[PDB]
Amino acid sequence: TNALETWGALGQDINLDIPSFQMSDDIDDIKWEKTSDKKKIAQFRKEKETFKEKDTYKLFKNGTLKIKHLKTDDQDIYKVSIYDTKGKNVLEKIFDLKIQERVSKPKISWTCINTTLTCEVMNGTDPELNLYQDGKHLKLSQRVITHKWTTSLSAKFKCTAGNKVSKESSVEPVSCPEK
Numbered sequence: 001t002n003a004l005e006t007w008g009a010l011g012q013d014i015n016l017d018i019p020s021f022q023m024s025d026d027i028d029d030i031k032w033e034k035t036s037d038k039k040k041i042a043q044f045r046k047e048k049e050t051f052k053e054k055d056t057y058k059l060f061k062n063g064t065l066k067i068k069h070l071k072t073d074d075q076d077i078y079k080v081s082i083y084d085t086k087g088k089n090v091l092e093k094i095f096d097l098k099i100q101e102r103v104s105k106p107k108i109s110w111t112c113i114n115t116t117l118t119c120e121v122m123n124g125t126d127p128e129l130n131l132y133q134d135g136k137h138l139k140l141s142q143r144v145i146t147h148k149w150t151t152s153l154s155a156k157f158k159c160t161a162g163n164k165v166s167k168e169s170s171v172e173p174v175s176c177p178e179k
């Protein structure tokens, strides 16, 4: 339905900008609306007043709308409509905001007794995990990664986790004399 997809982080702020715009005198009204609830979240009705539905919102002179501290409820299609003094619609841009939880630093666990190693990430939406040993790719996975060996070991393992909004990483030197 012609919207510009946008990714935002649960808990962080985000900015919806219209580069296609450049403010001026002729401009009489800039309206930002939230589709699903059909409600104007912010509006620049000339100096006549600066309306904002909440502190969660902020609208700038350049038409950019900042949404503070993203929450599950903010995933929605947003629309800006802006008009001059002669009543004309100068621009209309639409954004399709989806949000994800930032990923957390992965956690690596292991026993030398049982030749087993695990990498897991507790926080993060639809993450992707990669396991490396002394800089060489082991496995890619969406769920928890397991890695078993047999010999005595003294490697440097690296586990990455990432999604659309973040990337975290953890390296842990492993030494199993096993005897």
Ligand SMILES: *[C@@H]1O[C@H](CO)[C@@H](O)[C@H](O)[C@H]1NC(C)=O
Residues within 6 Å of the ligand: 015, 017, 018, 019, 060, 062, 064
């Ligand atoms: C609009 O202004 C804000 C700061 O007031 C800035 O963060 C944003 O990048 C600007 N966008 C444009 C298109 O000027």
Ligand SMILES: *[C@@H]1O[C@H](CO)[C@@H](O)[C@H](O)[C@H]1NC(C)=O
Residues within 6 Å of the ligand: 103, 104, 105, 122, 123
């Ligand atoms: C995991 O996410 C929760 C909120 O969803 C937060 O309280 C906690 O601090 C996060 N942990 C990390 C390591 O980011």
Ligand SMILES: *[C@@H]1O[C@H](CO)[C@@H](O)[C@H](O)[C@H]1NC(C)=O
Residues within 6 Å of the ligand: 113, 114
């Ligand atoms: C680890 O190895 C021991 C033998 O040394 C075995 O008995 C045990 O089942 C293994 N641990 C797990 C969790 O399977």
Ligand code: NA
Residues within 6 Å of the ligand: 034, 067, 073, 074
């Ligand atoms: Na919102």
